[PDB]
Amino acid sequence: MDECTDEGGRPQRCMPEFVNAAFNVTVVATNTCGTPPEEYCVQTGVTGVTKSCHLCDAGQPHLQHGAAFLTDYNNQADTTWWQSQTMLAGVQYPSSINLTLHLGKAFDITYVRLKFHTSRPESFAIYKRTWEDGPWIPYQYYSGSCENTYSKANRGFIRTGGDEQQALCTDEFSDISPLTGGNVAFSTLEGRPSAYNFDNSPVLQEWVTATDISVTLNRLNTFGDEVFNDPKVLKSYYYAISDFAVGGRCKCNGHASECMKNEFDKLVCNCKHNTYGVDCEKCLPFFNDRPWRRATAESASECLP
Template sequence: MIKTLFRYCSLRENAMGVMEEVCNICDASSKTRSHPASYLTDLNNLQNVTCWVSEPSTDYPYNVTLTLSLRKKYELTYISVQFCNRLADSMAFYKSVDFGKTWMPFQFYSTECQKIYDRNPNIKIGKHNEQEALCTNTHALTSVPNRVAFATLENRPSAFEFEHSPVLQDWITATDIRVVFNRLSPDQVTIDFIPVIIMCEYFYISPGADCERCKTFHLDRPWGRATSENANHCVGKSFLQFFLSRR
């Protein structure tokens, strides 16, 4: 049975600029003291800084899971998770490329990688394993006590030639992200995420949500990925131009 009333604590900056722990009561039955999942919010909106609070849970293997649907394919180079309190002790990132039908490991964080995730924290990434999910010691992450930042291409050998690496292009592509908190020390988290629906900018010549093909009459050259030097626009004539040229 899920409790509706429990105590939780968070880090706050006091008038002297020092971070201190402040404790409150979370009551799921109270509108003013509840912290539902709808409180996951964009960190950049300073007018609406709210925190989602899960029920306290520290007993592995029980977990708290967040699943974020991006609604289309994105290439993710950076994922930032901001906690209202300290970092979770052990958490795992998973990604899906088929809108949540299947999941694959993306990144692990834990003070005990081997015990919690059966992962060697000292694995080195080479050309042969550029799509391997690593496990990083949570305490070695950052000087910021309540933030984790996952750079998906960091320490991947082909990162500097990303535009020519189908392996890494596939590695950072996702339609959904799942964050699993396996062993929690804090009870709150906010995630830097804005749900939006994005269409291809040149939909009229590159149909499909991801601009993944060229439209009829725009096939003068094969479809190609955009690069930092060339947008690789589809080239051709519109139906009207084609019709007029045939008259």
């Protein structure tokens, strides 16, 4: 749907391509090993190394574990994984180790996925950014201590007619079952009562919009050896995610085909239907015949002169 009008005089709704929202973009992470010479190793079943007690080095690309390896082609021949600092830094806070993706425009994010290289964190969550420099709201809460960590009901659900914007807490990924390449995925329209009629739901349309996405790794799942505080035990727990998968489209509210990076070094929607703006939110001043509306499937949502 990269066209405005095919054969008729009136145009139709035009949607952008479903390109990945994390490809070839640098993600900012609070922590990153490599400048400190630090060794670590756990049960080596993840890869097959005899000990895997090597070091994180920033100067060695073949040994670095920074945020660059997080987003990439995700080739199955040689996966690239970002690794945080181990428990030597003591990763258990009221705060957390947070990594945030910057996009520069509102994107129609549909799903979020992660590929845990080493283990699923016991308690972690992923956050939103409705508008630039705006407040954060969460997608979903994965924790085995829903009532203790976030004080929320485990395996929560939203009934019909309720506030579907509010997130939930569930223990779907709490036990470290895969221990290698753990797949966790969340979709924006999962469990929403108004999902079927989402095209006529203003609340979902605004809520699904996102500019930046961050993950709050609250608690790191541990075997239970933290009591001894052994140095080998201390370095045997860490965070490692190999793929940061998030899907979305350049949200111009269905009034543009493609978004092109102009000389301002910022993305702008090539708005059609006599509109201009970051998301085609306003029609041209000469074309204020009718109020602006979302590009519904049935209608075209154009601005007459």
